[PDB]
Amino acid sequence: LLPVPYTEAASLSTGSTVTIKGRPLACFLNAPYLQVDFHTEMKEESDIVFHFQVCFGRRVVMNSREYGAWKQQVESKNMPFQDGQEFELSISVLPDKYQVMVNGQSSYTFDHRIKPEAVKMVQVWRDISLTKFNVSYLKR
Amino acid sequence: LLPVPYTEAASLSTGSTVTIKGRPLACFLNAPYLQVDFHTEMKEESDIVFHFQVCFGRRVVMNSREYGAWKQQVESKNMPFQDGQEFELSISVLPDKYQVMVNGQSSYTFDHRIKPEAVKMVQVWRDISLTKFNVSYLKR
Numbered sequence A, B: 001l002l003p004v005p006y007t008e009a010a011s012l013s014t015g016s017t018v019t020i021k022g023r024p025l026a027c028f029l030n031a032p033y034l035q036v037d038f039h040t041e042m043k044e045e046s047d048i049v050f051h052f053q054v055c056f057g058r059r060v061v062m063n064s065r066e067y068g069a070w071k072q073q074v075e076s077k078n079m080p081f082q083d084g085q086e087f088e089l090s091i092s093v094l095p096d097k098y099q100v101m102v103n104g105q106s107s108y109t110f111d112h113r114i115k116p117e118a119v120k121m122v123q124v125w126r127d128i129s130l131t132k133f134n135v136s137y138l139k140r
């Protein structure tokens, strides 16, 4: 129901959660992707404080793009996403890192390189359909 | 106007041309992809006689997937696609190879590994919108 690429203005801080519900657009044999980027401005050319890219069935990479340039990639072969299935992805902002839950299971983390307060936009794109996108804030 | 992923039943032989008109869904800085697969069956899990994958602004790879397994990739750094622009892609079936034209300029070729008569379906997907898809036949 939600158009992909999906772009939403957003603010993040400790206690924020970004929740995404979606489905890959192809079987895992054909290697669909999912990408979630937390941007510093509304323009898609802007810096990316948190880049999260799934190659379904193979691996996840995370990185940041700072003053136009990609930094050191983190790779994970953890693959909790299931072939042909809807997924629910939860990205929580903790004081020290993002925690990424997939279908309720802690699956990835990524230490902050730029403060989350620098985020102004979230983009969700590549080979998925989307049925839910929510940013929720629970102050500690 | 045409939904992506786009799938169409198709038959190919010498003199067939597949013409695609579309636009990337993101600026080249964000590395959108385009993928065109000529399949041996309507199911997307089926073998791929010709796989054509553009990482816009970086490179093109071509390959085949035969009895479930990818063969030897061919890589080209030729990049005639222009950032932010609509493209027109022409794939022509010659006796010995596919010839790929981009905006009227010969840009890639790929020798036949499986006869084109094995194709039953064409899928166009990843990070593009599509305004035209045509399969046309001119017998020599």
Ligand SMILES: OC[C@H]1O[C@@](CO)(O[C@H]2O[C@H](CO)[C@@H](O)[C@H](O)[C@H]2O)[C@@H](O[C@H]2O[C@H](CO)[C@@H](O)[C@H](O)[C@H]2O)[C@@H]1O
Binding pocket: A051, A053, A061, A062, A063, A070, A071, A072, A073, A074, B029, B030, B031, B055, B058
């Ligand atoms: O500008 C995109 C270009 O940069 C490469 C490195 O050359 O990757 C960077 O950008 C990716 C997002 O598009 C990001 O996922 C990477 O973490 C970041 O380094 C290049 O990707 C190629 O190299 C990376 C490894 O650095 C591979 O993950 C990827 O498969 C390659 O295509 C991007 O095209």
Ligand SMILES: OC[C@H]1O[C@@](CO)(O[C@H]2O[C@H](CO)[C@@H](O)[C@H](O)[C@H]2O)[C@@H](O[C@H]2O[C@H](CO)[C@@H](O)[C@H](O)[C@H]2O)[C@@H]1O
Binding pocket: A029, A030, A031, A055, A058, B051, B053, B061, B062, B063, B070, B071, B072, B073, B074
């Ligand atoms: O099954 C997909 C898986 O296979 C890899 C090789 O491990 O690539 C094959 O499939 C690609 C289409 O998804 C096709 O483009 C390749 O030609 C084919 O070898 C893997 O891709 C990784 O390795 C290839 C190089 O072989 C890189 O082009 C790619 O960036 C890598 O992600 C696919 O995930």
